[PDB]
Amino acid sequence: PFDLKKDVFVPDDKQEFVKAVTAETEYGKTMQQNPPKFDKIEDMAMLTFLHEPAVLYNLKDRYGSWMIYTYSGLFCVTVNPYKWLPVYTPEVVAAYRGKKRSEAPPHIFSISDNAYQYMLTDRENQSILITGESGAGKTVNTKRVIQYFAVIAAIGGKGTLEDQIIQANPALEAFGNAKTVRNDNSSRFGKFIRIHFGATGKLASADIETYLLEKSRVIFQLKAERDYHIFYQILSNKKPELLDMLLITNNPYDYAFISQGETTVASIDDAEELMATDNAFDVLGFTSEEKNSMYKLTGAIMHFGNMKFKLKEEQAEPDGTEEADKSAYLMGLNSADLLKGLCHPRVKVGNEYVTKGQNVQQVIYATGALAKAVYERMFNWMVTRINATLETKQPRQYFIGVLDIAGFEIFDFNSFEQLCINFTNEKLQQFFNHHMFVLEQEEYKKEGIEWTFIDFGMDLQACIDLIEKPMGIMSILEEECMFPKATDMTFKAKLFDNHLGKSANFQKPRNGKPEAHFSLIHYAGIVDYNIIGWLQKNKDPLNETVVGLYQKSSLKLLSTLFANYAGADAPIEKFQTVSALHRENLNKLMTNLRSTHPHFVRCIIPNETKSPGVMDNPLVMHQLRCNGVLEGIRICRKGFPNRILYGDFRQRYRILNPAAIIDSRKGAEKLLSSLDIDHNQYKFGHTKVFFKAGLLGLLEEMRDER
Numbered sequence: 001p002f003d004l005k006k007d008v009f010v011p012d013d014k015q016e017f018v019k020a021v022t023a024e025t026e027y028g029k030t031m032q033q034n035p036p037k038f039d040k041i042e043d044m045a046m047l048t049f050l051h052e053p054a055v056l057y058n059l060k061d062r063y064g065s066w067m068i069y070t071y072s073g074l075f076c077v078t079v080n081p082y083k084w085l086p087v088y089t090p091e092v093v094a095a096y097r098g099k100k101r102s103e104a105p106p107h108i109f110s111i112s113d114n115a116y117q118y119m120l121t122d123r124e125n126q127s128i129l130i131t132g133e134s135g136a137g138k139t140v141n142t143k144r145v146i147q148y149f150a151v152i153a154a155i156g157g158k159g160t161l162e163d164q165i166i167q168a169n170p171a172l173e174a175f176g177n178a179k180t181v182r183n184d185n186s187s188r189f190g191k192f193i194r195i196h197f198g199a200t201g202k203l204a205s206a207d208i209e210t211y212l213l214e215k216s217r218v219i220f221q222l223k224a225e226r227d228y229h230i231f232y233q234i235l236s237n238k239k240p241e242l243l244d245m246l247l248i249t250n251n252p253y254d255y256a257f258i259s260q261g262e263t264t265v266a267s268i269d270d271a272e273e274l275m276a277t278d279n280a281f282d283v284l285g286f287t288s289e290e291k292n293s294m295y296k297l298t299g300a301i302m303h304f305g306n307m308k309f310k311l312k313e314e315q316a317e318p319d320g321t322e323e324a325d326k327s328a329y330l331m332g333l334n335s336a337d338l339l340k341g342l343c344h345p346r347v348k349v350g351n352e353y354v355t356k357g358q359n360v361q362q363v364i365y366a367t368g369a370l371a372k373a374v375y376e377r378m379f380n381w382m383v384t385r386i387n388a389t390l391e392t393k394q395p396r397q398y399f400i401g402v403l404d405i406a407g408f409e410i411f412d413f414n415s416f417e418q419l420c421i422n423f424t425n426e427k428l429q430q431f432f433n434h435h436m437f438v439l440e441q442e443e444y445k446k447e448g449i450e451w452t453f454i455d456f457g458m459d460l461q462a463c464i465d466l467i468e469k470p471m472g473i474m475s476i477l478e479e480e481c482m483f484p485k486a487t488d489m490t491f492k493a494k495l496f497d498n499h500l501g502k503s504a505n506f507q508k509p510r511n512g513k514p515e516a517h518f519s520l521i522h523y524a525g526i527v528d529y530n531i532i533g534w535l536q537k538n539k540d541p542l543n544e545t546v547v548g549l550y551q552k553s554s555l556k557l558l559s560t561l562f563a564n565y566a567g568a569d570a571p572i573e574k575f576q577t578v579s580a581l582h583r584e585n586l587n588k589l590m591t592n593l594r595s596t597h598p599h600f601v602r603c604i605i606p607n608e609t610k611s612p613g614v615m616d617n618p619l620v621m622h623q624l625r626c627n628g629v630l631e632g633i634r635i636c637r638k639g640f641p642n643r644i645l646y647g648d649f650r651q652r653y654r655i656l657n658p659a660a661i662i663d664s665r666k667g668a669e670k671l672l673s674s675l676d677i678d679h680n681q682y683k684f685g686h687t688k689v690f691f692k693a694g695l696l697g698l699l700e701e702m703r704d705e706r
């Protein structure tokens, strides 16, 4: 039943919008709805009415029938079903091969296949960029893109390249993923995977690049969160030989470094996951000495935390050598030299040395710091090793990169790690804004198309400039290190003096919950940051006397993790910080993505309680707004999303009317007027015919008939 004029969408203070400027709703109490033909539409740029509730309800409609993918113009939107669906089967993978976007339902498999098609067709590198906040579905979709390519390639101990490519994700997940409030399997690092293809489309090889790992997790947890998965998988006891080799109990609560918050997760079987983790290292080519060395280092990290200290000026001395000895043998170090290094670190006196002193607070920091450094270097080594076996040295030509970054998050306590994660999210959103709204309209101008630049309001340059540009939050932090008389409050005072009242995205902390020092107006919300410990987190210093012992370790792995160590430069007669390298890497990635054809996949978390099928309209609308889904749909409708080179237009559509044809542009003008179409649905460019939304599909329908 449908009444074109009285069926409207009206606002609501609890449900955002409701089905129904004065009328009463379907329930009782006191923007046009789309017809029943556009129910569960596969592409929302084809809806007659385009507004916030038209898109919200179409997504909701499809979500109710477990259709978690929907095209929204030139890109795609996905809503986390929070449950398994029979839409990722090998049978499905095969059917999607070679199909045009409109010839199959919306799917991540269709994005992957079309990215493959554009690569070989245009002779151009591609990229698949998955956005969304913590627990939206970026990693799940990243794994399905890889699955699609690996299954397609497979058509034609250690396994084949296709098997290795798939297993690289569960191998890295044990060490780099952990349970946070928002996600039981949160990626605590970003990763860009490039899948290389030869000149004719053969999957040649692959590589992975990881971006900043949350080191703090290794030695610190908040009430509602766990440390990295790996620790609990080892303690599961499904492989009891590991507990004997690592010299450990089966109780996480016996290890402070890993038992500060939660220890078991309802959705994760830690026992089955240890086997999956181990099987991946096997399939990836990891030797037993390699696997055991990695397990041994993880074990040494656990004992390292239980090491107690005491007073002997305040000087620290070991409060029991029990835990240091266990750590030292797993690491291949002499226990006495380790504790002497931690308590009395060397100072170079030219060719001699004098030891400086430490107190139990200083040694406690250095101990935590080294356990983080080892963990970070182990993760970087695992990636290097995965890349080493993934390198096939087979002929390559193009690549399809896939970006799975750590999602936007807000915790009750936000620190340095959150600012780095959320900063990347702001940057990736701005990548989308620039590509969709700035470059797109500049193409129309380049091609001599009649057009008036539209302002979509999509521009986060103010917040990005606030964080990265000189005298920004990172620049202030970078200066405040390598200034020993600088404290947490000199950094706070410098941030406020430069940005309070001067930067719109820098506000006083809103603030029961933990104490915050400043607020930041991010693209998806105001985040209250706590600046305590930022100067030390950014400088990341290490006890170089203990690092020296690590380089001389009897374990090959520990000595290789520290072989190329940037030991503090020699003094002269009179360095790269964390944030500095992170910005450098983020800009390196953004410029690299500019040299590819991007394919945006926008993930939407439907509810805060990980409930399948439950859609919370205020949370969904917040995401669709800050993502720019409506803005991104309008540029598809209001512009010309499809454009064909005059040559290609005659090579393909000459069959529609051979009477029309000997010029490239002139011939194309004759062909188009000769057909029964709206002659306003297209424009003529310098080198391409620009088509309005949908006209390409109409001509392609007519081409398939004859």
Ligand SMILES: Nc1ncnc2c1ncn2[C@@H]1O[C@H](COP(=O)(O)OP(=O)(O)O)[C@@H](O)[C@H]1O
Residues within 6 Å of the ligand: 068, 080, 081, 082, 083, 084, 085, 132, 133, 134, 135, 136, 137, 138, 139, 140, 141, 183, 185, 186, 187, 407, 603
């Ligand atoms: N397409 C999907 N099908 C089924 N479950 C999904 C899907 N996408 C996400 N999930 C569930 O949601 C969780 C969070 O998704 P994940 O990919 O880890 O998100 P993100 O990487 O954005 O943090 C997953 O671990 C899984 O339980």
Ligand code: VO4
Residues within 6 Å of the ligand: 132, 133, 134, 135, 136, 138, 139, 182, 183, 185, 186, 187, 188, 405, 406, 407, 408
């Ligand atoms: O939960 V996330 O993997 O998006 O960080």
Ligand SMILES: [Mg+2]
Residues within 6 Å of the ligand: 138, 139, 140, 185, 186, 187, 404, 405, 406, 407
């Ligand atoms: Mg993830």
